Amino acid sequence: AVPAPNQQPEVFCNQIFINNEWHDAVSRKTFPTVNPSTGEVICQVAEGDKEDVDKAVKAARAAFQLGSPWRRMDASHRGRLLNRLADLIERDRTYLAALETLDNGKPYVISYLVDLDMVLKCLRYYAGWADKYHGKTIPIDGDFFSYTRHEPVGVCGQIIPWNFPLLMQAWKLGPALATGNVVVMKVAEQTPLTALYVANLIKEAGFPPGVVNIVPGFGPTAGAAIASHEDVDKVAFTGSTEIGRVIQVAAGSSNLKRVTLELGGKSPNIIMSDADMDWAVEQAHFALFFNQGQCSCAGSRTFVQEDIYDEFVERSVARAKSRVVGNPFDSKTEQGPQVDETQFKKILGYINTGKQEGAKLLCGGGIAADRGYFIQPTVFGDVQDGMTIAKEEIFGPVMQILKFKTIEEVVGRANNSTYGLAAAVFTKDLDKANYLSQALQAGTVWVNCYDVFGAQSPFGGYKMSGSGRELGEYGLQAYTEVKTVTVKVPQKNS
Amino acid sequence: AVPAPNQQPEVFCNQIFINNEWHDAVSRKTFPTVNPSTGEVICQVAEGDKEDVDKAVKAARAAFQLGSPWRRMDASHRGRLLNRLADLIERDRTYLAALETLDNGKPYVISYLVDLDMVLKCLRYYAGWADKYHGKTIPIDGDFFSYTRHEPVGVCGQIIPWNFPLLMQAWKLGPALATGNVVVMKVAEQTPLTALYVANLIKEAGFPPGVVNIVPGFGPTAGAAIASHEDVDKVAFTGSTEIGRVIQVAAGSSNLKRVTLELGGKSPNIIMSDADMDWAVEQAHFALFFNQGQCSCAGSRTFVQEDIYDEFVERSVARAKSRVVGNPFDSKTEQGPQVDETQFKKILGYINTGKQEGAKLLCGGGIAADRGYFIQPTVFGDVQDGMTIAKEEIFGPVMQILKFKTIEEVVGRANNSTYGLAAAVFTKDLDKANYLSQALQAGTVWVNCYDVFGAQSPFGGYKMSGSGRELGEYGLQAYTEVKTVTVKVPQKNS
Amino acid sequence: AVPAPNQQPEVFCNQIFINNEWHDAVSRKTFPTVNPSTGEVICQVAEGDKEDVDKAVKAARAAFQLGSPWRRMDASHRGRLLNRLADLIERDRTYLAALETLDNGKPYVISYLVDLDMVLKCLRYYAGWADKYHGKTIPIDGDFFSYTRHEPVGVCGQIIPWNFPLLMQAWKLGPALATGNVVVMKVAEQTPLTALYVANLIKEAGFPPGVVNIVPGFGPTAGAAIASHEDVDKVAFTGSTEIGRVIQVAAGSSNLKRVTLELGGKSPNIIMSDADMDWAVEQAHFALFFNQGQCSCAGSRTFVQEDIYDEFVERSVARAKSRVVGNPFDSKTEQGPQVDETQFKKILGYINTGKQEGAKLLCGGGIAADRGYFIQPTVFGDVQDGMTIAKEEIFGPVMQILKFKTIEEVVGRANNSTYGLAAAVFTKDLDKANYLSQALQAGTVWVNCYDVFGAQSPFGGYKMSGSGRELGEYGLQAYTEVKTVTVKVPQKNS
Amino acid sequence: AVPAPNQQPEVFCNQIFINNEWHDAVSRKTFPTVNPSTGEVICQVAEGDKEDVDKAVKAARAAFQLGSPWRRMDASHRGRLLNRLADLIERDRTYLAALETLDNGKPYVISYLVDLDMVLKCLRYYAGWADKYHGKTIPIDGDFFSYTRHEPVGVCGQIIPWNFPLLMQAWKLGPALATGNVVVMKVAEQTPLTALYVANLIKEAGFPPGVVNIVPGFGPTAGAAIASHEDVDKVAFTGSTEIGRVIQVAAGSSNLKRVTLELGGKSPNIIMSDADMDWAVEQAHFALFFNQGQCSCAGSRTFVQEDIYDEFVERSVARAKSRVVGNPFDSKTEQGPQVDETQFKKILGYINTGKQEGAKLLCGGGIAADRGYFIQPTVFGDVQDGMTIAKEEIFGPVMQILKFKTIEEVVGRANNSTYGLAAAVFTKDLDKANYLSQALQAGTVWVNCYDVFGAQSPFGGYKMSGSGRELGEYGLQAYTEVKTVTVKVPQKNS
Ligand SMILES: NC(=O)C1=CN([C@@H]2O[C@H](COP(=O)(O)OP(=O)(O)OC[C@H]3O[C@@H](n4cnc5c(N)ncnc54)[C@H](O)[C@@H]3O)[C@@H](O)[C@H]2O)C=CC1
Ligand SMILES: [Mg+2]
Ligand SMILES: [Mg+2]
Numbered sequence A, B, C, D: 001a002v003p004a005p006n007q008q009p010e011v012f013c014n015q016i017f018i019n020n021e022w023h024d025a026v027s028r029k030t031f032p033t034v035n036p037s038t039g040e041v042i043c044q045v046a047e048g049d050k051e052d053v054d055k056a057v058k059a060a061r062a063a064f065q066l067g068s069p070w071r072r073m074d075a076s077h078r079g080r081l082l083n084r085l086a087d088l089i090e091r092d093r094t095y096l097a098a099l100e101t102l103d104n105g106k107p108y109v110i111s112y113l114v115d116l117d118m119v120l121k122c123l124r125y126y127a128g129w130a131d132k133y134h135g136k137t138i139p140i141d142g143d144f145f146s147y148t149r150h151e152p153v154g155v156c157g158q159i160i161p162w163n164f165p166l167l168m169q170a171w172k173l174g175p176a177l178a179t180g181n182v183v184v185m186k187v188a189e190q191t192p193l194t195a196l197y198v199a200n201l202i203k204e205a206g207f208p209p210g211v212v213n214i215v216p217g218f219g220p221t222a223g224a225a226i227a228s229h230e231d232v233d234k235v236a237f238t239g240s241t242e243i244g245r246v247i248q249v250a251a252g253s254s255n256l257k258r259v260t261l262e263l264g265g266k267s268p269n270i271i272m273s274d275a276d277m278d279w280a281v282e283q284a285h286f287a288l289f290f291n292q293g294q295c296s297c298a299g300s301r302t303f304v305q306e307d308i309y310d311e312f313v314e315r316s317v318a319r320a321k322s323r324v325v326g327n328p329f330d331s332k333t334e335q336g337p338q339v340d341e342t343q344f345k346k347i348l349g350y351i352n353t354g355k356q357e358g359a360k361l362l363c364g365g366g367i368a369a370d371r372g373y374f375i376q377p378t379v380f381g382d383v384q385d386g387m388t389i390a391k392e393e394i395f396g397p398v399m400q401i402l403k404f405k406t407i408e409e410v411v412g413r414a415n416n417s418t419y420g421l422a423a424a425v426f427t428k429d430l431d432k433a434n435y436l437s438q439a440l441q442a443g444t445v446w447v448n449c450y451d452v453f454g455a456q457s458p459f460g461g462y463k464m465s466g467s468g469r470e471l472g473e474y475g476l477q478a479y480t481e482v483k484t485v486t487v488k489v490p491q492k493n494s
């Protein structure tokens, strides 16, 4: 059951969060955040820039000083704090879910049952990790006692996208705080509202001032400021491949800070002939159309074996046509609008390119409403590897269906991409599943399912889809700095 | 390629091994070891008893004293020594392979290509573990520095069987020595020769005196003395369920030493209807008849789906009838003789039991030769769960084939046993494989294969098949004593 | 801020807990539980026996059946349930603390600020482990895919003592439940009340029926019934060394169930000459007298370097004389009564033994009150290793102070014991701390502190103090059954 | 006991190593390698460039293709190959030690007893890791089976310096090869000889063609080609901070390849007043002057407490003056020449700067010989934090001694640096050791010792000294790509 939402939730936070206090931009400037469903302005938000970032970094650094409350706090207590924050978010679940939908555009039902649930599960998972990421006692040669201390990396700059505002915030804060680090987060200008409210809950939870600092603003301004800052130890980024390069170069040009990236993808979703038709079709649909198709791991390349291609396509087109697009607050809506005008136009452009290049338009292909940024569920058939829609990340409700013959063939074609975030295999055969799951060059390989995220399992990309992993135990590596301590002893014994 | 064997290998070691030296039993008594292929005496061996065990324990304890060569030795050097031992074993591979066959009875080809190969791989695997079984630095609450030392458990008593003489010795010494322990090994009275020769290689390898001590003798005498010894810290045993109880009781009645056991089994080998016929038949045959059927993890309960039962049985019978039984030194021999007269009679007894209780004798069922302890590859059809040959470990070339209809049914029947050492599933279906591998209550579940042992993968039993695991990283747990050291520090910081 | 205690809480639970319901003993019999501070009967409690245990095991086994709610439940949810239980315990903190004091005798202040706090921290720690105890994917030889599943051991029999009623229950349930096992707990006949109330909270928390079953009763009856049960997979025990042997023998005589023990000790507390006098004195005092001296890890052997012996003794005697003994509910009380009459007489007997064998009685040595089981803080000086009070565990407010000269000397004397649960070292010197922490044969070695327990760090004994470890990651090992699954694949690749 | 060297070792390898074959540069160009002890040319070496690097990467990629001998090879076999390589290096130990001294300049005794020894220990350590870096089976939510595969990162570009020619090669190949990766190594132009010969041993060891490819040449040419290559998956670099920036920027500008760096340092060596004088003096000397002071972790900032400053300096000056500088082949030589003319002049420049800025020259300060690049062991006293020689990495036989009063003071001064590779603490006090080891912001903190390297313990820098760790288990992280596989199962059970 989903509690009825408030289609016009009030905004309580719209400024820069530093030292557990709300601040206006030093420039006093503000930027508008739009409701993609109506195209109307929700409210103004403080436009942070370099000077605001510097204030945030200094606060975080101060909070990270040896002997500070955050540093002296027991590891188990950091966990207690993460749990408390989770409880606070759950208490305000209905509000946050609605506010998320208002600013992002995704269906309210989805924000409540999926986004918010996963946010709670992520924070509670890492809460448990706070006092369990042990260091090591090493049996080094000679008369010595050698061991490693797993210390926090320090001031962590976290730049997140807009597709999953609350979840992205959770995926970043969870591991960072669990390991005792301090954060300076730059949320997307398109969806800053929800993140800012959570900061209020972070203060309420009892987190010391400066531990978490949020700076809303634009990328080239606030974002680049964090990436090039001389006092930021680590930077985590999730977004476009283009900016990924900028972040890495900025890090190498500044203080050589640690970097980890997650930069979209063109994930192949292979459907073998022996696959369960009904299931494969529904999952393939979900694989691509999920969250308005705005998922880095979306199945944007649906490979289907020739013997079942025709039927699969027929069913897929039917499922796409039946996909209800409309007001995200209406319980019957399956697909809301795209996040903004920029994306809206970009997707329409890709659709145009698909038609131009010879791909077969089977359904949709145009705007689905006069107001807002709605696009019809579009499906392209007989797509070839060389086509643009088959190589570039659309990030919209545009499905590409390709045909293939042999398993050896699909392996090469699926791996022939600079991306490698995820992939899937639908088959009933044990050997095929193992052959493909091993052969596919991707961070995550789903078998007979898709978009199955668990705070316990790591997520990250191969090749140009990024580096490093998020979630699970692996998610703690990037937020940990290893220190070896080798002490001379009188006489070492086993 | 297998080097032509010396069918009459000379015996160089036949005494008690203590402090790198050979000793006669204090009683000066000796016992004969027989060649199961001829029934003739190979030679006499020192019959160790309590007083001999005491000498061994004292030697081991002294070698384990703080500041001793074995205690001060670099962990990495322990690895170097294990690798050296393996090299020495490989140098003498052809000799050991023959001697193994002479005393045990298994085919020389198998002793060479399988037994010795696995011995080498085991020692080399664990050699690498010597300096990698790290302790931990814990983020304990308060102003403290807490860490754990992974220390050796101490003087380890190891009582091993006769089915895999050299292999059993390696599976025991490998983990024990890698972790810096000392050993007092009691080898089987039926197969003491090969183990003794290896002791010679242990001294040649450079191991300090007292690190490894071998005491050949009988169970109730030497074995019981180790199990009840007041200065033996841990005991590892592999053999009968009956003696398993005695060992654990002995441990609890003495100094409460740590115990780990491996007590045989009645492993189910499920063959689903969609399984590859030829493959399943060959593997099901190997699963049961391997090493004269003297494997604790033998597939002694071959469950076959009714739809393929008739064909499977027909093929299994043909394969059994074609199985060459004869002189283990002849390259054409697939099956040698049983280890001794005791087992020979026991198996014959079980065979008669099978006939008596209504099981259908399909082939074999009697003695395969005039001299030696050879038994015909026997196969029972239409076996029921309640039958004795379906519940008790035969440990001989006697195959039981049962029929079943549904997968839910076979799960309950397979798990309806006090044993739980291993199990197998032959199916092409993904879901079936995962369903069964999860449902089966066994230490090891092989899918579309059987008897696949890897030094990297743990092996052990569920229920009454034993406790604890051998091989892999897990094999080091039982040979490690954990010490927590909590130091008060001026001010604890993350 | 310690809330005003309910000097005599009302008893709500006093029966056998099975399938989340309260049952009388099959025999309808009941036994009295006494308030040690007055010697008066608090109330009657159902006297469980073999038949009651049988009902509990069947309930647990049923709850552990494949496909059951407890088995299908997400690992993360088991964590949610453990956290919920903790919150319910914190809600009823004030009540539990008082009830604990009423049944056990320990000071209410200590029950609240120490016992209950530790219980909460224990449950919350393990709650986080629920979904993080990963199995492994192994790079086994040949064309195979090998991995391990970390499954629950099954039905766990947990027999606990009376010194820390609530804490012992948490230390056992925390790891067991986090790993998905089922429990049949046999609490101490002396202190059954608090544990039984927690069972009510367990039901309220939402744990499925049969997951946790508590059977109050006597040792030779209910306790032995669990240890010898044919369907109990594992047994955890904490208590006397004598009973420890009985349990291990019972296990070996029955179904060969897995065993782990914690059997008291005679922990050495080494005070070097360069130690901080004031600190060492107060700590050595706490080390011995904590919880009426009823701690398995009590520093019952206080070794003091000759150069500071005299002063240390003077100060220690003064501190002992100032130790307030009286009504546990009075905020000024530092020491309450002993758990019962049996312990009361046993301690007085040991004190008389101390006098008889030549130990120098410095203070106390007799009964501290007319009613109840109160004993005066006793301190013996010039104690020799061979003395009874220096070898046997007193478990009372009786301090043993020994003198020594060299560091090499103290190591040997400290290690010359069949016990090895804990030890301590008080020194300002780096090398001395490292030398002793490595040389001492004990499960835990405290440096410049004592009785420092953290849910993060393992606790267990060496030699005859037990086997296996509790708390920390290690605490999960004994509650985990490892299953290896090796699957044949088309072609193995790195 | 060092075997008399061959002061004029013959050069057998001086070309580019690709697919186990020797190739001339495409341009046919060659560059001279100088003997720093004489200033004379040893021989010509193929000058690899972009086109040569391309051939190498293509070879490596080919060797990394799925189904290749290197990919299909058992993980344990990779270990066998690493051990074989070590054995081959040990066989030619005397030759390589000499060749190392000839091209690098370090004393032959040190090359034999230290460099080569450490090379062997590194290779053999990692050989053991080959089949032990397990992935995980995760208890993810819902009806799924999730696990991770620890796969090789791919084609690894490794650019190494000249201070430890053979050791740097071992530190890079060991972990990369153990995890199944392929390598394209660019050795230093100053010291290419020894690495090239090892390549010949790599072939002899049995490693498949293309697994290891070495391209000798200049940095801006061959080195930059690798860092910017579109088909190189990961790059590991050790050298100057300046080039570290270039590498990371090249990576972000190219294919976003993974990067790990080790960029020198200015490691503080704190000597407390209570430290053992004689020991601290000798170690402080070794800490700085080791390998002609050409160590990234050199104790270039010797902080000494005022109360002992005078005596410490007096002793250090004496030890510096007695330090034998001369022909590295003479067994009495403690210090050889600097690697080349460029470093020679740079160091002299730094010495001149030290004098100019007010540092007190205590001894040395000039050229130590007519021919070759020998510098006198120089010691500067009364150095202040703001001085150039106190901030910049000299990388020569130039010691800086600073004075301090309090422990809190030295912490801030030691940490006031952009570097953070290593640090040391000399004290007899437990609390001071622990206070400092935790407070110091460095990758490695040595206590009462220095330059203690063990293949078991990780080494890496904090801040601008680099990112990532080498050696130990941690050394495998950067060479492993994590793949999550989540499979849908019929019904998930614990
Ligand atoms: N688990 C396994 O792999 C093996 C199981 N078995 C089973 O055991 C049955 C009988 O063969 P046995 O050799 O008699 O098994 P067993 O358990 O009696 O003998 C195995 C080892 O235990 C020692 N032992 C015997 N009595 C002992 C005692 N009182 N205290 C301490 N150690 C003692 C023996 O000397 C030998 O070293 C076989 O038919 C088969 O069912 C036999 C060999 C191996
Ligand atoms: Mg952009
Ligand atoms: Mg027997």
Ligand SMILES: [Mg+2]
Pocket (backbone or CB within 6 Å): C240, C243
């Ligand atoms: Mg008793």
Ligand SMILES: [Mg+2]
Pocket (backbone or CB within 6 Å): D240, D243
């Ligand atoms: Mg340069």
Ligand code: NA
Pocket (backbone or CB within 6 Å): A033, A034, A035, A036, A103, A104, A189, A190, A191, A192
């Ligand atoms: Na917006």
Ligand code: NA
Pocket (backbone or CB within 6 Å): B033, B034, B035, B036, B103, B104, B190, B191, B339
């Ligand atoms: Na024999």
Ligand code: NA
Pocket (backbone or CB within 6 Å): C033, C034, C035, C036, C102, C103, C104, C190, C191, C339
């Ligand atoms: Na009581």
Ligand code: NA
Pocket (backbone or CB within 6 Å): D033, D034, D035, D036, D102, D103, D104, D189, D190, D191, D339
């Ligand atoms: Na050179």
